[PDB]
Amino acid sequence: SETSRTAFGGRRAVPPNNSNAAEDDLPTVEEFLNVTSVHLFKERWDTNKVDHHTDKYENNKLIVRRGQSFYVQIDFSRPYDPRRDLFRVEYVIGRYPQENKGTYIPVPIVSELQSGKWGAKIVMREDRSVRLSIQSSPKCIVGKFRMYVAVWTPYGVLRTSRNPETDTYILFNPWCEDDAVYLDNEKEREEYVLNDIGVIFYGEVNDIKTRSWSYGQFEDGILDTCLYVMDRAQMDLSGRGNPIKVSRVGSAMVNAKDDEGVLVGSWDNIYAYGVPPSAWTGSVDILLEYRSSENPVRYGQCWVFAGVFNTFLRCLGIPARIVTNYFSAHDNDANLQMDIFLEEDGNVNSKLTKDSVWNYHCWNEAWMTRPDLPVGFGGWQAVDSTPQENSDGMYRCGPASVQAIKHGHVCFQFDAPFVFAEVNSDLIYITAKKDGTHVVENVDATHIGKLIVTKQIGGDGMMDITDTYKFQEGQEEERLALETALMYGAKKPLNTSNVDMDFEVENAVLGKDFKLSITFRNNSHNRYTITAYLSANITFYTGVPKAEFKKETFDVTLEPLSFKKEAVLIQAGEYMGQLLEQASLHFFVTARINETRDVLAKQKSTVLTIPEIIIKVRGTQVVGSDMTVTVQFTNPLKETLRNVWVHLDGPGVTRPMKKMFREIRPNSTVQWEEVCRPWVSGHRKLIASMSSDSLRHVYGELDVQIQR
């Protein structure tokens, strides 16, 4: 050194352009045409928004989709004359726009539009007006841009001044066939992009449950919040036109780390200083509270993270759906074995058995090509915003090609070995001997990833998409996929009579008793004497066990060629003080055969069916018209439920609202009437939840038809 003074900007000549909200001031000066006014034909009934499928947003600015032409008109001081005039529209985004970064976009006047390029074609010249058909690149950056008109002269460039009224959002475009996010099915487009109401699947594989969720991607403020989310990630504006990077970054913002992303994750069941995850009714109040407070919102769990992320994708224009995997091996570290340790007597060792499978776990799928991959891997891409340990740390996983997962090609980014293990792991039943050695007893290859579902395109029904992640157990394709996976990230760390045991557990209403029966088939011609053990645990929906509420031992003598069934009754009083939110229960039935020391082992989950909220309506059901909605909850339980928060939602019918009733005494009903004034017409939906100081994960809804 040897100095000229003042701090220098030596790392880069221009600061990162990583915020849509920030802006520069473009010079208005850098006889000649002069712009007197601009018309974007942006009313929601007009051609541009209707043809660009953007008429739903509650937003009065123009919003179009990339890769597709839209119409503008510029009025000038005198008629435009091609013999001496040169002008172009410009679109500009961020504080440091640059043409080579895609963030300063001069749109050239062309004779004909070209596939793939930005261009504006003069389709009409009338008096002093010119009408343009403007096409954007199908790879354009997605965000809110500033529009300008520039007039080129001999002395330099004159430009219009800043005008917020012409700010134009450009979004991804599932209808545009050259856009990465091209989805060639109108019906799929409506469901995965334009439907603002979802269903989540929960409960357990043998007692599926179904709750409704407001994505609300068209509601006021939501689109702007999705841009804000990217700004808070400091996402480079130049990567916001890549649906892969968009999904990679935005998903990383869903779970809050410190005081940085959108939702604080918590499964502690009490939720002191926030709002239970179970209470949420959709993404709207969460996203708006994030943007409003500028801090993480408390609190979420996997379906909440998935609800919000699904809103983010849909709103920006990437087709997205929520998936529910039944028996989910999360926190896998890419191992394909989950260990259950037994004692020598055949009891579960609860000291060692510490890995749990989730009764269900939700994540996201986002549709896009994968031009970075060998051909064949585009389509749905699994993205799970609920973090687990991957190659980098405790983070989100994905985007991972579902097809690549299905084929074992888990070397292709991102985090595919982790999502592969989430649905393909085996249960391994291991005896931990009293000398400290370990012996493998048998392996259960059919429990994890048993069924995988998502909402149907038609209606509220369940679609089964198990076969999209995995081939059929037993056949060549499934074997080829495991063999490949084991080469590229999947691990199997442990290397891997005539008695069948199973068991069935009755589904019941919360507070009711239920039956369980155990069944033995001895096909052999020999006699067996078995000691079988029943262990029945309160658990979170994650599988995490809180308490053994019921233990039992059966002594069985098996005759040759026999079938033997054994029945027991669990009373309500054996679990009723003890249940966690979601009310799930987990059963082990494990048995050692005395003659052979063979292990038979089986597990099953159950949830108690919890009470629904009743919703009803009267009055006329008309956009711009008052209807009255009644929210009804009848406590059927003998505690007095305390601080009973009730939440009402339904996109286009009401914003999200909540009410608390200080207590609901045994068997009483509360009611809460709200006058709503729908703003969206057609088949809509009122949505409610309740959480009290104890009892929660209570839902209700009502379908309503709205006229206008």
Residue 3 C-beta-side C-alpha neighbours within 13 Å: 4
85 is in an annotated binding site: no
The token pair that represents 460 in the structure block: 């509220």
- Which amino acid belongs to residue 177? E
CA dihedral 458, 463, 469, 472 (to 10 degrees): -130
Nearer to a copy of itself, 168 or 582 (CB): 582
Strands 207-214 and 263-265, how do they pair?
unpaired
257-286 residues in contact with a copy of itself (CB under 8 A) are: 265-270, 272
Tell me the window of 58-66, 197-205, 544-552, 595-603 that interacts with a copy of itself (CB under 8 A): 544-552
CB of 387 to Ca ion, least distance (A): 24
Of residues 123 and 443, the one with the C-beta less far from Ca ion: 443
373 contacts a copy of itself (rule: CB under 8 A)? yes
What the block records as the tokens of 496 is: 């891997």
The span of 174-182, 409-417, 451-459, 700-708 binding a copy of itself (CB under 8 A) equals: 409-417
Which residues are paired to 670 by β-bridges?
633
Looking at the Cβ atoms of 29 and 272, the one nearer to a copy of itself is 272
Considering CB distances under 5 to 8 angstroms, the limit depending on partner class, which of a copy of itself, Ca ion, none binds residue 625? Answer: none
437 contacts a copy of itself (rule: CB under 8 A)? yes
- Subset of residues 332 to 351 that bind a copy of itself, contact rule: CB under 8 A: 333, 339
For the chain, what's the residue count? 708
Nearest to 560 by CA among 520, 601, 598: 520
CA end-to-end distance (rounded Å), the chain: 74
Phi/psi for 401 (5° steps) reads -60, 115
Q: Using the structure block, give the residue that is written with the tokens 């017409």.
A: 681
Q: CB-hemisphere CA count at 13 Å for 174?
A: 26
- Residue 356 interaction partner, one of Ca ion, a copy of itself, none, beta carbon < 5-8 Å per kind: a copy of itself
**Residue 426 annotated as part of some ligand binding site:** yes
d(CA 354, CA 396): 23
Q: Which two tokens stand for residue 589?
A: 């039935």
445, 515, 572 from 512: Cα distances, Å: 33, 10, 5
Q: Which of 229, 128, 253, 271 is nearest to 581 (CA)?
A: 271
Q: Which of residues 564-603 bind a copy of itself (CB under 8 A)?
A: 576-583
Angle in degrees, CA 194, 68, 18, rounded to 5: 80
Please, which of residues 129-158 interact with a copy of itself by CB under 8 A?
A: 150, 152, 154, 157
Indicate which of Ca ion, a copy of itself, none lies near residue 445 (CB less than 5 to 8 Å, by partner kind): Ca ion
> Is the Cβ of residue 469 or residue 540 nearer to Ca ion in the bound state?
469
**Nearest distance in Å: CB 105, a copy of itself:** 12
For residue 121, the SS3 value is strand
Hey, which residues between 16 and 35 contact a copy of itself (CB under 8 A)? 16
With respect to Ca ion, which residue has the nearer C-beta, 479 or 638?
A: 479
| Closer residue to a copy of itself, CB minimum distance, 300 or 678 | 300
- CA distance linking residue 443 with residue 428, whole number of Å: 5
Whether residue 424 is annotated as binding a ligand: the answer is yes
The token pair at 412 is 């292709």
Residue placing its CB nearer to a copy of itself in the complex, 394 or 568: 394
648: partner contacted, choices Ca ion, a copy of itself, none (Cβ within 5-8 A by kind) = none
For Ca ion, the closer of residues 142 and 382 by Cβ is 382
Does 473 show up as a binding residue in the annotation? yes
CB of 356 to a copy of itself, least distance (A): 6
Q: From the CB of 445, what's the least distance to Ca ion, in Å?
A: 4
Question: Which positions are annotated as active-site residues?
Answer: 302, 361, 384
CB of 159 to a copy of itself, least distance (A): 12
| Token digits of residue 297 | 């919102």
Query: In this structure, how many other beta carbons lie within 10 angstroms of the beta carbon of residue 129?
Result: 16
> How far are the Cα atoms of 200, 424, 515, 627 from residue 197, in angstroms, in the given order?
10, 30, 37, 20
- The partner in contact with residue 624, picked from Ca ion, a copy of itself, none with C-beta cut-offs of 5 to 8 angstroms by kind, is none
Task: Give yes or no for residue 209 binding a copy of itself (CB under 8 A).
Answer: no
CB of 283 to a copy of itself, least distance (A): 22
Task: Please report whether residue 672 would count as binding a copy of itself according to CB under 8 A.
Answer: no
Query: Which residues face 548 on adjacent strands?
Result: 537
Rounded least distance, CB 207 to Ca ion, Å:
21
CA-to-CA distance for 575 and 590, rounded, in angstroms?
A: 21
User: Does 635 sit near a copy of itself (CB under 8 A)?
Assistant: no
391 binds a copy of itself (CB under 8 A): yes
Contact pick of 79, 108, 376, 619 for a copy of itself (by CB under 8 A): 108
Reduced to 3 states, what is the DSSP secondary structure of residue 552?
strand
Binding of residue 492 to a copy of itself (CB under 8 A)? no
The least distance separating a copy of itself from the CB of residue 181, rounded to whole angstroms, comes to 18
Helix axes 222-232, 302-316, angle to 10 degrees: 110
244 — phi, psi (to 5°)?
A: -65, -50
Which parts of this chain interact with Ca ion (CB under 5 A)? 445
Q: Which of 372, 483, 500, 673 binds a copy of itself (CB under 8 A)?
A: 372
Which residue ranges make up the annotated binding site?
A: 424, 426, 473, 478
Which residue ranges make up the annotated binding site for Ca(2+)?
A: 424, 426, 473, 478
